[PDB]
Design a protein around this ligand. Structure first.
Ligand code: THP
Ligand code: CA
Length: 129
């Protein structure tokens, strides 16, 4: 897998964001995770966390997996990195997302994310409190 450049257009919520990629505005949905919706418990905090992580970054990158790159809603499916740190893994590690939506052929970072989830759960963080 390869990291590709993108720039932030706008924060949306815990697991979606508007980025510019190859010079086109796209909504990205983060692979392998599920954040609560904004109206649900920990939704606000998931949104804030994702927002902060990407607004503070100097360099956003997106990494596509081996499978489909866009979902049925036209959202880009990627791992997102903020100054080299994966946003998908960070949300899970903080108990602000669950590992989810693990489809065959787009699951390269499954086990990395599951390890983060086990550690968030041990610590009783947020969703696991
Ligand atoms: C993360 C992800 C979601 N989706 C689709 C599945 C779900 O369809 P449904 O809309 O039919 O429930 C939806 C979940 O996204 P959200 O959690 O953003 O709603 O997005 C994919 O198709 N591929 C993916 O990798
Ligand atoms: Ca969601």
């Amino acid at each position: 897998l390869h990291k590709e450049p993108a720039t932030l257009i706008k924060a949306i919520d815990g697991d979606t964001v508007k980025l510019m990629y190859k010079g086109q505005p796209m909504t990205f949905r983060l692979l392998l995770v599920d954040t609560p919706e904004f109206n649900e418990k920990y939704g606000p905090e998931a949104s804030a966390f994702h927002k902060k992580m990407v607004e503070n970054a100097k360099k956003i990158e997106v990494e596509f997996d081996k499978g489909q790159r866009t979902d049925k809603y036209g959202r880009g499916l990627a791992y997102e990195y903020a100054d080299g740190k994966m946003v998908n893994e960070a949300l899970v590690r903080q108990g602000l997302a669950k590992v989810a939506y693990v489809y065959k052929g787009n699951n390269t970072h499954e086990q990395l994310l599951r390890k983060a989830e086990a550690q968030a759960k041990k610590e009783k963080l947020n969703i696991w409190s």
